[PDB]
Amino acid sequence: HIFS
Amino acid sequence: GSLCGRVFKVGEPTYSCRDCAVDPTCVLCMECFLGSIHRDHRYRMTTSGGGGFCDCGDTEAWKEGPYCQKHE
Ligand SMILES: [Zn+2]
Ligand SMILES: [Zn+2]
Ligand SMILES: [Zn+2]
Structure with a gap:
């Protein structure tokens, strides 16, 4: 997953 | 099947699917x-x-198509  | 697990580099494009992602943080x-x-x-x-x-x-993480050709 990615989170800004 | 298998997991990719690649950790992204600085500036690297990542791709979610608005149709299939369970959450907007799900990416390829x-x-x-x-x-x-x-x-x-x-x-x-x-x-x-x-x-x-x-x-x-x-x-x-995916409503359909959890794997790609490489990891299927
Ligand atoms: Zn990957
Ligand atoms: Zn999709
Ligand atoms: Zn893959």
Whole structure:
């Protein structure tokens, strides 16, 4: 997953 | 099947699928994206600042097409  | 698990580099494009992602943080690296059914879907690109990881192979992250050609 990615989170800004 | 298998998990990709790739950790993204600074500036690296990442791809979610608006049609299939369970959550907007679910993403694929470009290689998995281009090998996946989602290349024909309503995809969304977010650039990594460095970090995060590819969710290819995670059958809980995708409503369909959890794997790409490389990881199936
Ligand atoms: Zn990947
Ligand atoms: Zn893959
Ligand atoms: Zn899709």
